[PDB]
Chain A
Amino acid sequence: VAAFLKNVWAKEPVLVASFAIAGLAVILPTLSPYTKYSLMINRATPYNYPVPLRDDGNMPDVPSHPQDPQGPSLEWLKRL
């Protein structure tokens, strides 16, 4: 497991680099703390119009204005 790796690194370093880069491509997004922020930035990007809701009378979490406190915020993206 150690002589084999040195043998293939001496003979075929292109393939050793290929399997190492591919293995780091596979396993490292599951170990990265910033993989969550990729999803958050993609869902925080407003391609569509934010179609407003009819105020039935009881929606305390939905704002009446963009500059109201309630609603989803992007302070994490300005700060990071």
Chain B
Amino acid sequence: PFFDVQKKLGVDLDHWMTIQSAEQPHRIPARCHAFEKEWIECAHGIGSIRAEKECKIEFEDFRECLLRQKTMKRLNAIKRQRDKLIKEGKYTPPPHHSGQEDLRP
């Protein structure tokens, strides 16, 4: 029994804090605003059973925005191979990845 009093009376008791893509103070975006907007607009109205299978791409992009697991795994792989090549001596870091280039602006 989800008695939907908020939709029945037209009052917004708690829909405003429910998602990150809702109206925020000073129009501050969430970091995953575009991914959450894509996943919500994909999965809207088609029901949860169809949304599990038909919006999997947007939901996987949004979960990977939220937790950055694939990104951190890729950075792990790059940094580990870099440390292995530094230990083997088969690589040297450039001057712009050592701190000798006096950044852009």
Contact = CB atoms under 8 A, between A and B. Distances in A.
A and B touch in the complex (CB under 8 A): yes
Interface of A: 47-48
Counting chain B residues whose Cβ lies within 8 A of the other chain, the interface size class is under 10
B8 interface: no
Contacts of B27: 48
A49 to B, nearest CB: 10
**Secondary structure dominating the interface of B:** helix
Contacts of B26: 47-48
Interface of B: 26-27
B87 to A, nearest CB: 47
Nearest to A49: B27
List the 3 closest pairs (A to B, CB-CB), nearest first: A47-B26, A48-B27, A48-B26
3 contacts: A47-B26, A48-B26, A48-B27
A47 B26 CA distance: 7
A48 B26 CA distance: 7
A37 B26 CA distance: 20
A15 to B, nearest CB: 36
A27 to B, nearest CB: 27
